[model samples]
Target chain A: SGLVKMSHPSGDVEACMVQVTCGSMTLNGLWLDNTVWCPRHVMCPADQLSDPNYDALLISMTNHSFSVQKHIGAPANLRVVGHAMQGTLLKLTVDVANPSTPAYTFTTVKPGAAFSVLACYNGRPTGTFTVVMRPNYTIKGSFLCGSCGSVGYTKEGSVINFCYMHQMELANGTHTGSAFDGTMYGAFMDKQVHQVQLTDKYCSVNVVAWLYAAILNGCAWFVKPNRTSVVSFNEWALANQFTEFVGTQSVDMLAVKTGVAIEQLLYAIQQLYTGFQGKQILGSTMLEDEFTPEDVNMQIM
Target chain B: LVKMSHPSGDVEACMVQVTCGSMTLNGLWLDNTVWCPRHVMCPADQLSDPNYDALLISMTNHSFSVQKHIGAPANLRVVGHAMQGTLLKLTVDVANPSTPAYTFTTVKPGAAFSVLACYNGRPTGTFTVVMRPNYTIKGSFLCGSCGSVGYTKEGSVINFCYMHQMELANGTHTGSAFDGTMYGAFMDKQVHQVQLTDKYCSVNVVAWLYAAILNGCAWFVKPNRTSVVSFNEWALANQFTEFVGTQSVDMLAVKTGVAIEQLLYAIQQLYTGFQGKQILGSTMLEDEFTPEDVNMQIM
Candidate 1:
């Protein structure tokens, strides 16, 4: 069935048209059965909850700040990382001060480490009921011509690479390594090339390198030629960041990832020096050591 | 010059026209550059410095902030971090935020920390700004690819660039390198053909000599019909930052809501270029990174 549209914000705003077909397709076979396709500001209200309240305050362009007060008295066990998963959609609510920022952005942090506000909806912070990043993202990558597609191990033999990979089970030891026959493959869907296999613990680094290569290759055709500056360098060098001091690209940042910021700039400098060495795709030995996607190594994998 | 035919500036107010041309040109290199038959915004305010900045902040979607603070403290500096060579423009006052933030040190703290200040025209700021991880989103990857390497620190969630990056530089840059130089050269040859440069840049140029060798196996490396995705990051594995994006510009301002005048605040605001790409789309690629984005002498 096609996604049904719902009324919202103003009488003029377009209804929330659910692309159930495209939604189903984009998420087909993605290990996480709970995967969702959220398009901008749109959603289907739950049977129990009333249609999103227009009076509901929003947090978009103007940085949002507010305290939570739930029916159950704030979340008892509010386990979340502030991803803004479940929420009411608002059409372009431009920041009165900065209309350019997107209408809605997933929340990422709790301002500093203190008790700050997520407030501003000027209305109740309803709609976006849940604030979290789902653990069920489908893994995607690229592969070499003859390499085993599923298991992703350089030589093969590892087990869990295939079976648990397709399920998108990337949590802690979610699966045991009792399933490798050495041919890099995604057991669940043989067609799903396991570029970077993850079975519970270890993930193949070389495989990851390959995957990154494939992804980059897939989109390489889109990178366009850079544009030249409109003005000369002399005139360009006069600008700077006010209050905070960040500068422009032609006259600032690009020289170092963080420009003059010693930490990131130094990192960029080191990265450039290393570039003089080589890349990740070649040299099998280098891949093994750096990635060390070791057996049962404990990390947030 | 044409302007708003509308007598009043209001909700019901209408518009008009404005234009400027045949302006004399002066530069170190070309005495005559294409006038494009016309320019929309016309020339940069010769009286004021140029500018650029970002639209969104607070997520991995953002890139290295680029703010241009022109005049008086005549300065320029992009704070924070980002893609090795992402293009950015920083302007300080272009419609500077109604409220502003500054850094100060208190008796307890030894170092200065960022603090917000009140700017005249700013919208209210009872709100809080959250700090998120600066993630890389635009690298490379098509519909169907393999699991690739993802860069991580914190606040990073999607990890989309597995498509292709220098993948990893240094000793890691082995394997396939998609050299577009030959394709570019071949394309250049096509340009030469179209431009009637058959004389070959003055004689000895076979047009296909060093070009063929650079691309490796011309038969296997044919150019694609589409030019949108022409300069893939794959080509500059060696000296990427130095030569990468040399042809591109940062359209974050003018298009992404950053007023050409308020380029400075945009930098302290964003965290990554991918965010700008997602927000500004085509516009971000239209602007050429200004010198305020690449130079640093303005302490």
Candidate 2:
């Protein structure tokens, strides 16, 4: 009694109209389009919109648009109506059987969850099925920078140094306690330390030789430009690649290339910028991959 | 009786000295150049080359220079007389019981082999139980890059891919026959594909944007003049580390500067996604990376 199909097209109705109804509540037109393979929307029972995680929602949808077994998790039977993206906004439509009776209402949540959802069906959800949700973070100030192979992740005002957690893995191969420590097991974290290692190593180079070389590498980025930066969302999804490329160039010939000491150049740049006046934020907050995809690529810059 | 002491030096001398005896072997000092952990050399052992694993007799003395109990198939008991090396040549001084009045009259297999001899306990016979031989390889151009998750130690020819080899674990995980394909089971090959996907996408930005950047990143190396290329033997021993570091920057932002991505990067960079250019022939290839060192701190 969750979804149904209408015979004739009515106004905006294209192929199938879906509405969720339960008890005495009826929500109409849950879906409208039908092209995209997977289009996820976030919504809750009618009147429950004010509360987070009210009743049920379209949750993180990865590898679930067509699988029947996975569909059991959905409120009703539905098919991809259609979907597209406008900037960061996602538009989706689905073909679904209309419910004999309607239930509470629902809405939409876009962009997506924090962590990646890796789900595959091998004879019924065998092996470890991991689903994670997290929020992005921005660096607040210059690195206090001393730790090696370590980084911090914050949640609920608590900072977790996941390296020590992995250190436990190295301690006991069968380690199970910290397996799900998100900060320690996910991507993007390494570049954080790698970034630090680069900067820290820069300091070790002859200061003057470091700068002259760094400026040259910096200018080369403008001259030749790294294409991966301006390419697809997946490529630029994380800007570590761009930053890393730049970092290595700083040490070209260990600064012997330009005969410029990168540390000195860095000292000059720090002096020029007057020491990163503004706190650094994730470039995604402003660039949005729309007006300036290049900006997103160069965000590391 | 394998070895004896010079009588002046103080140390335990044990085991029997051995020689292949009189087929009249023509070989040079298997090892001369020291400065490395495993400086394998060969003579009656066919091929020998320089650049480190060159002709030598005396080498740097390490507790491991002469090993015992590590011999693959034992029979020879030997010891370094006294090994020394110059920038270009090696000089060795050894005191054997003269192979039973030099019956073997063995000479030179200058560079390498497989297996160390295990010999011990000396009244007259002392220890340095050395045993080894050699091997060769000629790298061909092009990365066939198809192996799923397996490979073979073939004497010659080449290989395409090795994946079905590791599929047993995947097949058994679900108790199913072949649960995951070679593509799925093999580590980071997809990431390699993923890397391509990234580069392929870069071309979307004006096409030239793609080539220009690719060329730039590639040339950055030639331009920057990475001296590590010409650095010390220990430094170049692990050139993969340098190449791997360059590949990661392309994804730096994806990690968004998190602690997790950093760890994952280190783990992956250390494994599957490895890319190194220079040949792996060892001037002193006898070394290994243990779990403890990783656990030691930089976990």
Candidate 3:
């Protein structure tokens, strides 16, 4: 029978219950089940909707389309997860929670391969070609070209040498090693290059000889120049140039001329001699000890 | 052209010719080499006068023999002469230059005495006394065993018995004739005379006698011999020994309200030379001597 045939459905018609699976397409396999009455509005689970792993969900039905979007989540902790020496280069296994996109944009390379990246020496950016990064979060680089065996680290996608960082520590007079690691490598770091030859051949040797003599005989090495009242290192070094330099008169005259006491002169000579010895020993085998990153960090701390 | 005479009133054979180097007195040429005698003739009456007996005696005692001068007129040219009522002064040059010229003077006209004296029962040499004008004894006797000088004024009975050693008389107030006894003597109570005796003289006897006559007792007690000897030694070392002699004596007497003439004389004798002359000039100025004035003179 044609009972109450109408053009639209009314509330008197019975509503049916239904079940639907709410899922995020961007989250790859993440889903949730949601239930509501037929002809009633349905929503995803609050837990799945607020989940950070999923960006948003697209809901599609017979005649409706909708989207559930989420705010952007925190970026991943991109860091070096593993490191090793490959020949003369540094190879690093870097990791991030999701590295699908470029977490830090930098020069990139193929997996298990090397490419040019920013490089640093003595904790300062020197140039590129020192390190590289790949899409697989693997890094490979070489400091061997200019920064071999020297202290260094990486920041962003660049490689750095910590040689100048260690030198900064040495300036405090508390660091107890050569600024650089290897003897031959540290030889390239002398500030007084012009003074090095004479210092190594004569000045430092003479200072070492005098120091040895002083250690054996209670500072008799200081007395020869003291007798001349030579008030400076230069004066003592060139004392032979002085004519008629003899006796207590000359001693007093030099003392007055310099306005420095004999004891002070001796102390200054001692300081300069030891300072010269220290410089000579800096790049020599005398300070061949190696320093680790931890050791340098402790000094900085 | 005047002729020189002896003390006995005899004219010398040679006329007076006083010459020094090539110069002659009175512009007269004389053959005589001997100069005029220093002595002048006394009045003829004075030679026989009894008042001059003390002068004759003293002159004889001083080794100018009066008896020899009376007979030998050639030996009568006196080195010095003075009248009785006038001042009796003499100055003798000593041989040693260091030794001062011995000078003596009677202050008063009749301040001279010479007498043959006997002390106790013994004869003493001629007792002589010389006095200053103030009647204070200038010095003790030059020749006497009496040991002390005597002082007297006119009409004063100078008893020899009392003047000598005092001896008890036979039922009389007068002392007996000279017996061998010595009584210590001192200035009398009246303070006008010195009572002589035969006793040993005390150190202050001369000082007391001076005090009695000068009417002051400043130096009545004499300094001890040790102090005097020490002072004398110091004076001799400093070459002021001449001041210790008559100058010091006159200074002592002059301090006792006497005339300043003696003090002036003493100052003149003590101070000589350029610096001393400056001091003398300042001292006579009647102003107080100041250090500034002394420095002025020194500069």
Candidate 4:
């Protein structure tokens, strides 16, 4: 029914929590099934598995040379890019980094890249996993807003546009484009937003943009704002990876959403960001164009 | 006269008690720039641009190059990377404002170096960076007695305003005061922290003007509205609803781990301007100038 708190294996200083949907509810034709909201401790991770289920790898912020270890041990080289935040908030985001070169290609890189370290405890990073950007590579994905396809585009498209434009303006000091411009709208029709992407290799950014548009519209997923009966969406891209980043408007957003103290909400979100290696997640400049929701979703399987 | 609420030594602590117009209670000012219904504008005849277009365009291009090299917005390129990062010996470009922009080179990413810009044979400590790529937490430039002249660069934009001693309402300025012209901060006219968000995604004046407009969720201009307090009431609810979509208690609990009531009150603080809306926000639009229109001219 609620969060089940767990500890690091050693309990020396690691923490994490898990939120489980106890039942299924289908309302109206929009409705489906219903079940008991039970906390099955045995079936759950039981605080076992490192916070998030990053069975592929586990990396932690270890000194300047963050340590990375494989769960299965295949000795695979991982490519990741990370940037650090030091004030108001502390973060280290290390996703599979983008290649340092400026060239573009057609092969879409997915979020479930070669390796991942989804390591965070009680909503904070277990360690400050270190990551470096690959100095060169082939740009083979539609890493722009045009590739995700228009299958899920909707009116609330403005929200994603708002997020992206602000980031670019703040970073580049210029307006890239708006959600209205016919140029921007055309990109949503088929995956062809970036000047380089002549074909359909979806960039993660665009995919998330498409998903958000489809999932949220003026507050309603299908109806109106506050009318949606569920959190109907998929972990379609790395963009969905940071829900805290999206879910909270401010600590106020968190407080309003959960009715928690600014401090508690902040602490919880801090842990969420921390547990998820938030810095790299939030600051990553790379794009995974190949990975799809089908790749990670067992329900689809 | 300095930000007396806390010591500069406590660099990590959040600042409270903004310095106002008159006297000090303990240390903080009286919080005077009344939300008490008022129409306040700068004491200028026919307000117009102070010739910032040239600077805006030049700096805009330069900032892009800067972000490319530094990898992120939160960075200060003090003492490195110019002329292809290929310097064999110490060099200073002796550039001011914009001409012959200061450049550092080393053919490497993180290299420690020092540079000096002498003004008529007087050392200005020009620049120095021990940390490679210089991505520090905060920006600080305190001159001995330089008439309160200092600059701080956050993200990629650099300016000389501090939310600490900076007054929210019309009053004096500790900085240049822009050639004796009155400069003061304002509240609620623009975006404050949004509901169900963290400080990380907080949108200030820059964000409000940039994000709010593009989304077209709310308008930033209020020609008829005299004060910010009135303008904010409309924008707050409209923008909040648009931004958050549906306010689900379950989603909030699962997402941020905070209680529902607490989140409501926290977001409530966004309005009422009690939360340093002025300082936390931006000082760009304290007067009757529409940024959207001005930015149009630049474009």
Candidate 5:
């Protein structure tokens, strides 16, 4: 009765069914090892997410051997899914809904076999994650799905869900990496927060925080008396009027004006604030447009 | 009774008692010409005046001459009178047919003027004319017994063989004396002092020396009895030579124990204060005056 399904004659193992959700769309899929392989709609209507028939059809074909077709005069009623190979063998069940309908199976001519899963973001394929299966049906290393809204898999249960923007989740805990490296994600299962510590208890390695720190340190060195050293974080925002000077460009400009390299300037700033320890002094909101000379000196001194 | 021999191998007959100026004279006639030494007497009435008597005596002292005109009777008329310093020059038109004019130059007091008479282009006779002496000092050299001499007129270029001595004296005739001889070109106006034999002193140096002396030698009068190089010696040693003009101010600053800026400012102040007064040579010493000269006035 379904378009496709799978079964084993040993009568001891049953096919596994899984549910995959991408943005607002949900579909029934198969759970194999640590990956959930789903049959996503391609060349489908925009209303497919709300279509009850589309959902029922995908769920019915989850454990069955079936063939999908699209006739010239008939509407498309077929779905396709990729399968992994084991021992150079791949199996699929076929059942014809109509006696007069034609079916065909495609196979690759390469010697080795590799499985690939499409990475979807907001219900669209963004990238592909490929993995080579060993004779024991196990994968080697962790796999990152896509950049921005990426899902990373490690071993059987460890999953790193990089939520939108700066929020991320790893094995149901929060973590951060070294500020110097810029990437917040570090090695899997390693819990050390690698921020450049101002003191034993207080530290910040966020680039924005270091940028503000560099600015304050620059003012101390370059600004004359009776001149204000205050600056706003929005002044460094991307796509701002000073876009060319955002981020490291701004810091490098300050470094040049102060007669030092960027790294040396940051190191100097790190030393300046090392004795002072508290909560992250320059928070996200503190950078907006409210920073003042007193605020700079509070952390600087 | 006698015949005169001519240098041209021609002989002339001698005539006796030729009338000349209310008197007769012995004369020679040759080639339609007469030659004689004529004696003329002053009018008896004019001689009564002292001036005319003096004039008559002056005319009798020097020899004078006249040329006879063949075409018309001629008279002597004064043409021009010019007095250049002590020399008085007179141009007279003798109204002779051949040679019309003669000039006589004389100085007042012990000066004389004379002429040689010619007849038919031949030497004739000699007569006494006029005598005078220099009347004005002007370009004349007047010397004192002490070897001090000068020209009377301003701007007169006079060279003194002996050192010219200028003394700044009071009624008692007590003063300091500067003895120097003019040296170099007149255009340079350099003076060589008898004391500073090898050094040439510019006018600025002289003026500075004068001012220093007037100021009681303040240049050498320093506090704590500290001795300094005398301004004259310093000036002579550092005198502007070929290229010293550029270095004079610097040398002056070092010698005077002042900063270059201070020296320059002082000079500038003095120049600004006394501009157009003709007391200083110029604003810049190297331009017209030497640094020593200005420094002397400054001290």
Candidate 6:
């Protein structure tokens, strides 16, 4: 028997490039939660924990739990039950038509081999499978960096450099290497670097500017907040929309209104991102719809 | 013609990899730019420029004001000719017989491409062959931030994300294809990203902590600052390294004198790189460097 996973979740993709996710689960009396779809899914799903199908199959992905497929035929399975912080509990569960037979109750399988065991069906096992466990590495196939075209996975320790080969394909035409590499690599680093550079560059001007301007903008805003906003927005639309016709006449005149509105918009966007100062790159933002009984709309902060 | 090697040095016998060099020469100097090697063969016993034979080659990298190459059918041969900062003057010179020719005209072989004063060779009276020009992005890890390994030509944007076809090398290798997504267009972007990661990642806890101390000098720095930094009510409305206050200096001081000395030693390795500086504590720096403590003798 080897480590094999049948990962299919019931969901609908309403938007473009949205991740496929599984629905909710009922544990005991409470419906636990839906599994988040991280971009790390390989052609073969990554960590068995990312899968929400709890208890359906042994060694599958759950949020905190782990069923790392060891080389099949190992004496016992390592069912690591986990939490948000740490993990424990390599309990046993057998498939002898016994629900109570803890998962870690295997009596065979090698130390590191991952194979799926086929229960004897119709006097013979239906199918058998094995899996090769490795670090979340890029595949042996082709990979490309931004400018570094037609690259491959570098050798050991050189994975970050040109190692595109180690990345496993997630879906058709779109492949990301193991976490911290591939497409996500640069953006993640960029997010951090941008924050660093932003802080280093704009820290001085923004705070003081915001304060003095806030009074000016706020005074003007309070005078006719929403109405002025609409007018300001309309003015922008006209200027950008009819720049060729108006040329300098209207543009030069609307400069005062536009600058104020633009400054206000800048203040708003900065305020929105201010709360996210310590967030790591690509850290998952909390979902807006959290399966709330209300209509679900995504909050992408 | 051999395909240019992107990362490694030249490849002689390998199959052409459809390699393209997105080279940009941002800064070119006259009389002093890197040049390619040139060779000349003459049927006559004497064919030289100026007083020296191939002394022009010695002055090869020197910036020239103007250059032109003309290819005529007589004694005067011109390889190249054009003015600086002008279109590329790729003229092939077929000489006119000196016995009866008053003026020797030449033909411009290739289209006129842009040329800058940053070139090494002058248009000669006899150059029918085109030695390829070498250009590439100057990406090197040693240069630290944004080291250029490849370059883009003038007026053309140096796009890092180029959607590339994955060419499967030997049965052992495969080609890399990029999806038309936000990040996967330019090949150079991907390559340089990996370079940057490998480079800045070398920063360790010490270096980072050290930098925090140095750069924090931009404002008043209280060392050993907060184990946790809170966003000021005002900062939320604005931006920066702002907090209620900062950490303390006394707390930043290592507990043991030995530890302080060790840090000093680490900083002193590069003259002023935090090593070998005297510790405020009462530890003898000589004791750590003694033969008993360290393995090697003093240089």
Model 4, A164-222: lDDT tens digits are 10001111121121121112211221111223312222233222322222222121121
lDDT of each: 0.17, 0.20, 0.23, 0.20, 0.25, 0.19
In model 3, the Cα lDDT at residue A288 comes to 13
Best of the candidates, lDDT = 5
lDDT by residue (B1-299, candidate 1, tens digit) is 00001000010000011111322111000011101001111234521221111212222212222211211121112232221111111222223221112111111101101111111111001111111111111122211111111111112121111111121211111011011111101221101122111110100011111122222312212222212122123213311111112111123222222222222122112212324222221212111112222111010
User: What DockQ, between 0 and 1, does each candidate earn?
Assistant: 0.01, 0.01, 0.00, 0.01, 0.00, 0.01
- In model 1 chain A, the worst 10-residue window by lDDT is A4-13
lDDT (10s digit) by residue, model 6, range B141-178: 11101101111112222111111111111111011111
Q: Write the per-residue lDDT of candidate 1 for residues A83-187, one digit (tens) a residue.
A: 232222112211122211113212222101011111011111111000111112122221111111111111112211112111122222121111222111233
Across B172-193, the per-residue lDDT of candidate 2 in tens digits comes to 1000001122222223111221
Q: How would the candidate models be sorted by lDDT, starting from the highest? A: 5, 3, 2, 4, 6, 1
lDDT of prediction 3: 0.23
Write model 5 residue lDDT over B1-299, tens digit each, in one string.
Answer: 00110111111111112232343223222222322321222233442232323433455212222333222333233343322211122234542223211111222211111111223322222111111111111110111111111111111211111111111111000100112212211111113222222222233333342343343333322233211233324444454212222354555545554433323233323433434333222223322224433442233
Better of 2 and 3 by lDDT: 3
* Tens digit of per-residue lDDT, candidate 6, span A1-301: 0000210000000000011122221010000111111222211222443432323332344533322222211122323233121011112221222211111211221111122211111111111111211112111122221111111211112111222211223332222222212243212220111211111112211222222232332222311122224344345434332111111232222334334433343333233334433232111111110111000010000
Count the clashes in each prediction. Answer: 123, 107, 6, 70, 22, 125
Error of 5 at B116 (Å): 99
lDDT of 5 by residue, A1-301 (tens): 0000000010000112223343333433322233233333321244542333433433443432323332211223333253232211122222213222212112221101222222333322222232222222122222222212222221111221111111122331221111111222222211222333111111121222344444443323311223211133223322232111123344344445445444443343333343223222222111121222222222233
Winner on TM-score (1 vs 4)? 4
The chain A TM-scores for the candidates, taken one by one, are 0.15, 0.22, 0.17, 0.17, 0.25, 0.18
